[PDB]
Amino acid sequence: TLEKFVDALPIPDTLKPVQQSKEKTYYEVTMEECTHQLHRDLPPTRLWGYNGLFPGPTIEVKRNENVYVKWMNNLPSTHFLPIDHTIHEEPEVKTVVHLHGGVTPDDSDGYPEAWFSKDFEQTGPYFKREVYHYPNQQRGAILWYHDHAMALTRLNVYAGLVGAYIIHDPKEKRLKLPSDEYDVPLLITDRTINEDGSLFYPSAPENPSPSLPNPSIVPAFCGETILVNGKVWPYLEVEPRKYRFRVINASNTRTYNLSLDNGGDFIQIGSDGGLLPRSVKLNSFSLAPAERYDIIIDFTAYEGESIILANSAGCGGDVNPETDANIMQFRVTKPLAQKDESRKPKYLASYPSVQHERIQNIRTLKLAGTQDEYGRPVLLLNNKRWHDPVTETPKVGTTEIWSIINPTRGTHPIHLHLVSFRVLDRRPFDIARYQESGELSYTGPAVPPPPSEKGWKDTIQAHAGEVLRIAATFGPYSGRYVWHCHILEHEDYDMMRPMDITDP
Numbered sequence: 001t002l003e004k005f006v007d008a009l010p011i012p013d014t015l016k017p018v019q020q021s022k023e024k025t026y027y028e029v030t031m032e033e034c035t036h037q038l039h040r041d042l043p044p045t046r047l048w049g050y051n052g053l054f055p056g057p058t059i060e061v062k063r064n065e066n067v068y069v070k071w072m073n074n075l076p077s078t079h080f081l082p083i084d085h086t087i088h089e090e091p092e093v094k095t096v097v098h099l100h101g102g103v104t105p106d107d108s109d110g111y112p113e114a115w116f117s118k119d120f121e122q123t124g125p126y127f128k129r130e131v132y133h134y135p136n137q138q139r140g141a142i143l144w145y146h147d148h149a150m151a152l153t154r155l156n157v158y159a160g161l162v163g164a165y166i167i168h169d170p171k172e173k174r175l176k177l178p179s180d181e182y183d184v185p186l187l188i189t190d191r192t193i194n195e196d197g198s199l200f201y202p203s204a205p206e207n208p209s210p211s212l213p214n215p216s217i218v219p220a221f222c223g224e225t226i227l228v229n230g231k232v233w234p235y236l237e238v239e240p241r242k243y244r245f246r247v248i249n250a251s252n253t254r255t256y257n258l259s260l261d262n263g264g265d266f267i268q269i270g271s272d273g274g275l276l277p278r279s280v281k282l283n284s285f286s287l288a289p290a291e292r293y294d295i296i297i298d299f300t301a302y303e304g305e306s307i308i309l310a311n312s313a314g315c316g317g318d319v320n321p322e323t324d325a326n327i328m329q330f331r332v333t334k335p336l337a338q339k340d341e342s343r344k345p346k347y348l349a350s351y352p353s354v355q356h357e358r359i360q361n362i363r364t365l366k367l368a369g370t371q372d373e374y375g376r377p378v379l380l381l382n383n384k385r386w387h388d389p390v391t392e393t394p395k396v397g398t399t400e401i402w403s404i405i406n407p408t409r410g411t412h413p414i415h416l417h418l419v420s421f422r423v424l425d426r427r428p429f430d431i432a433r434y435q436e437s438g439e440l441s442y443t444g445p446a447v448p449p450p451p452s453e454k455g456w457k458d459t460i461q462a463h464a465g466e467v468l469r470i471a472a473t474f475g476p477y478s479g480r481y482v483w484h485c486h487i488l489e490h491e492d493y494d495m496m497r498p499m500d501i502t503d504p
């Protein structure tokens with residue numbers, strides 16, 4: 001396997017506007033097939049990148065900044081990863097950019113059927129605009145952007161179409177959180193890489209049934225190798241002081257459980273939807289696809305040390321000490337550029353619980369699915385296909401409780417577009433009884449969320465054999481959005497549903 005910790009961690013450059021005034025900011029981003037070295041000992045890898053970069057450029061905006069991005073497809077007309085056409089004259093390569101966590105008008109949200117081919121030559125049925133509009137009228141937070149094209153999301157994202165997007169709220173500057181050079185995004189992506197440096201993505205399940213098509217979708221993908229910011233098991237030289245890290249799980253399937261091998265602590269300051277009400281001291285944390293942890297690590301007491309960011313969560317088996325048990329390495333050997341004037345405050349933001357909202361609707365949803373003509377699992381939300389008439393139709397400005405029942409064998413990270421939400425509780429139930437009769441019989445009391453989940457979330461782990469309850473206010477915009485599992489192999493077949501936020 002590839003030698004760990006021999007490449008420095010890339011810090012994606014911050015994207016510069018094409019045009020900017022007090023009234024609006026304008027960016028242009030072009031998807032390009034490019035080559036990049038993923039490790040010291042590998043030949044360059046063919047990848048798909050925003051502005052030809054993997055990851056894409058980091059976009060930094062202010063709260064309420066009127067931002068426009070023209071996302072353009074200049075990719076080849078044929079994919080380099082295996083497409084399974086059985087899961088859905090249309091072009092082979094379809095793309096659309098979704099700003100994950102964006103409080104965004106529906107035609108700028110990157111609807112899966114709002115895709116476009118090269119030069120916008122062909123467009124999906126929901127396509128409306130070339131230039132996307134992000135008003136950014138939302139809390140300061142770590143967002144990320146990635147491809148969302150119908151039935152191709154697992155492939156386009158794996159190809160390299162991911163990037164970070166940070167909203168800065170000037171009202172939070174007074175907290176004196178680590179900033180600028182000491183505010184670093186970490187986009188974590190697992191990959192399998194061939195000897196010749198080319199990306200590997202499976203064209204079928206291992207030793208497939210002859211009934212299965214070729215290529216065939218797989219229900220999950222676990223990469224052999226871990227990358228951070230487009231480099232295999234990198235090192236980051238750090239100064240002996242406080243750093244803020246924007247930790248993003250940009251992987252297809254893999255969930256991480258992160259810790260420091262010297263026994264050091266993380267201080268979590270934020271979740272998907274922004275700053276937590278109170279900072280939380282953690283020795284470890286779980287991070288499923290699309291979840292974000294905004295953390296401070298204090299290296300002040302660790303000068304000279306090499307500290308591994310370690311992973312204990314298995315993917316299709318136990319972690320391998322020499323491979324996927326490792327994420328990256330910090331080396332506390334960089335000379336101080338300046339006095340550490342940053343803070344790790346306890347009091348950060350308003351509790352979500354301050355705002356009282358009337359519960360307009362309680363929505364019960366089950367995670368299940370079926371089997372197709374080839375014998376493959378088809379994962380479904382409420383046993384409905386993507387193309388079935390819309391059923392999730394919250395009214396604009398109203399608050400709902402969603403009760404998500406998971407009788408399956410694994411965790412699903414459930415994501416809702418547009419909104420961030422509060423976690424209410426999790427409660428275990430009798431799976432066998434539910435699958436037989438449809439009746440919920442609880443096997444224990446409800447468990448309130450841990451401090452890490454007392455803030456705002458947009459992607460939430462729904463564990464096996466539990467009912468998860470969340471509360472969301474559906475606004476400020478009305479329109480056509482989506483909700484889905486963010487395991488991309490599940491999302492594409494077919495664990496995704498439209499979500500209509502309706503106006504009277």
Ligand SMILES: [Cu+2]
Nearest residue numbers: 100146290486
């Ligand atoms: Cu996403």
Ligand SMILES: [Cu+2]
Nearest residue numbers: 099100101417
């Ligand atoms: Cu999203």
Ligand SMILES: [Cu+2]
Nearest residue numbers: 412485487490
């Ligand atoms: Cu899933």
Ligand SMILES: [Cu+2]
Nearest residue numbers: 098417482484
């Ligand atoms: Cu989505």
